[PDB]
Design a protein around this ligand. Structure first.
Ligand SMILES: [Ca+2]
Ligand SMILES: [Ca+2]
Ligand SMILES: [Ca+2]
Ligand SMILES: [Ca+2]
Ligand SMILES: [Co+2]
Ligand SMILES: [Co+2]
Ligand SMILES: [Co+2]
Ligand SMILES: [Co+2]
Lengths: 237, 237, 237, 237
């Protein structure tokens, strides 16, 4: 059904579906079983920043995640996205909770896509930046439990009044406009995404994670993708 | 019905509805009878560039139109757009032909909107740039006769095979995503639009013009707005 | 000697040289006696953000200053900068202390200048953004007491070890590259500057202020411009 | 003496110093003998566009060169620039002619450098874009025979009145401000450069080429680097 390319900030180690034994960042190409992962020293309650970059010349999707005053984690994977995704895609953020939970709060999100064609000076670009989300954010498609406006933030999963994260929740936010990532006369296509997040859990084992993803434009949350599936995959294959 | 704020590049002088006796650029606030105009030395067959700028501190909508090697024309009008438009709008380009005609070709179009809130570093921004239009431009809403892809250009009004402009045509192209132009904690909201166009007519009296407009998100072409109404207004009041 | 256009965030009311009886933001065109001012509810110890904008079509220099959770202050003045400044200028930040003092800390500073010429697609642009200053910031010209690197910030005036602001201090930081603000074939020239600051004083009467300024490229601090002259003017005329 | 990293658009095959037997694009790390090259179908008299990209996560310097209506050439090389260049560098364009010659005209040049630190939202950026060069371009350091302003272009090597390219010429243009390409708390540093050029020769064997380069800030043209050395290297080792 959906084609998903995602960079996951996986807070819970589901070693039975291939997660390493620690929080990790991973690159998922059409499967929750990451093609590549890197240990991530996740800090409960701290605001982190994730940067994702890719260009069609190098064909390497790379991500860097850091927290202030801490060393960063980085993961890269060689993948030609022209062979995985459609030429028009939607980009978004997804997060879930299962039996274990955490807040999956997004405080800001920026994205820049550029397609440079062979005509002298031909650049097609799309750029958006959100440093605040309003209750009626018309340029975002919110799916599942995702809501905007509480403290001007984007809450991907359900958080009750007293700020408590709820389990078995899943939510996604996609930018409204389709994004053009391939065009026949493009000599270089590239994108960069950055988002700051705040994962906080009352528990010692937060779950399940946040993911930046690119999908077919009409992507919707797969049935039963709460928990370990991060609101992105229908199963764990 | 629709709320329209537009900068018109009016090629035909309809002196009966208030046009001056020459091609002119004008600022239209909810009426085709421009609030302010400036003589425009339109060059048939040449690529021109229009720049439109506005910010909520000064509340002055200004536009500059020029052709290479020629002096520019500029028009400005003091208007608080927060009092005219909704907080979420769609931006687009419109053009029409009537008994007289011309090609209303758009070769590139860029737009940048910024909302800076009172939180330190809070900037919400939207930027798009098209230097080429493809046959299936999914991020544009084409209305009426507007088509994309012929020579990688956006043809707002009908042009037959042999490149001839057709009369009684009207077409509009709006960027897919809603644009947020006001927010309660924004200290300064601004936008700038730039587009290059090519108006060419076999006739000595081209008509009717191209307009950059901002409207309510659900705006559609008014019935009978071909010709002098530029695909923007239902009547000439 | 120097030609100075500045937006002052004046913390001390020197009513004898024309200041209003309160902290105020003002637009200074070649004189410390502001052409226009607006009351500024300055917050000692809080990080504020100032936005300055200008374009050659409207010829209005406007500035907005705000603090989180507080209403902003704005001041505007109609001035054609082509008639005041040279075509090549340097942009900077200046601050001073006199008998009264305060820290004049800059935490981030961004600037964007654009010159759009009448050739189709001719845009000359300069943009810089500093969200951190290093001890050896080679792209900034530091004058007087200005230093970079302490807490990754730019300290315009002297602050001793224990964080205490020192009196009779003056310092300026200018971006290294000259900025082109006028060109003969430019149809619209514009700029926007934004900087966040932290003015903190142990005293009830902080002084003297911070100013964003544009000057001739070879501008240097005028002798005796500590205190009320903000490191910009040689006298109070 | 100087540390040079350059992307060369080499028009003349000096097979004795390792050039392939055809025009080629190459990546030169401290030597004119390119670490990697790719055949380049150079078009005499046509305006081409070169794009150079690099980021510190992937550590791969890649370049794409194209002409309208033609397939592009691309070359990439894995190199960690933090191990080759200083943290502060100057970026520029260089070109030369020897016994054979060609015009080495630059019509536009843009550059964007970004350093993203681990503090949430810490981005330091520098961006410049020139779509026109004036006779007194104060923000460019012209070395050797390089001149600005003729037809609003940048002529890297000497061209006599009648538009004829002169042999044994060498010229370079560097952006005035130093560029910061590494910082201790940066999690990702990246840059992208784009320039359009017009290489035209009356002869069947144009020479010698144009190069985009990054060097130590105080770099100057090496003595005798006309011809095959592209105004970048003192010898052919
Ligand atoms: Ca997991
Ligand atoms: Ca008319
Ligand atoms: Ca004062
Ligand atoms: Ca060679
Ligand atoms: Co995982
Ligand atoms: Co009219
Ligand atoms: Co004052
Ligand atoms: Co070579």
């Amino acid at each position: 059904a959906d084609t998903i390319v995602a960079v996951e900030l996986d807070t819970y180690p589901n070693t039975d579906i291939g997660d390493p034994s620690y929080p990790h960042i991973g690159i998922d190409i059409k499967s929750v079983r990451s093609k590549k992962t890197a240990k991530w020293n996740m800090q409960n309650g701290k605001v982190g920043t994730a940067h994702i970059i890719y260009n069609s010349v190098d064909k390497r999707l790379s991500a860097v995640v850091s927290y202030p005053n801490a060393d960063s984690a980085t993961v890269s994977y060689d993948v030609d996205l022209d062979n995985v995704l459609p030429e028009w895609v939607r980009v978004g953020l997804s997060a879930s909770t299962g039996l274990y939970k955490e807040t999956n709060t997004i405080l800001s999100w920026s994205f820049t896509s550029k397609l440079k064609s062979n005509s002298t000076h031909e650049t097609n670009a799309l750029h958006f930046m959100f440093n605040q989300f309003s209750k009626d954010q018309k340029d975002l498609i919110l799916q599942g439990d995702a809501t905007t406006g509480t403290d001007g933030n984007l809450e991907l999963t359900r958080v009750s009044s007293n700020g408590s994260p709820q389990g078995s929740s899943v939510g996604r936010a996609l930018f409204y406009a389709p994004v053009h990532i391939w065009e026949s006369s493009a000599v270089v296509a590239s994108f960069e995404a950055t988002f700051t997040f705040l994962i906080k859990s009352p528990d010692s084992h937060p779950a399940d994670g946040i993911a930046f993803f690119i999908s077919n434009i009409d992507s919707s949350i797969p049935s039963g993708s709460t928990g370990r599936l991060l609101g992105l995959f229908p199963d764990a294959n």
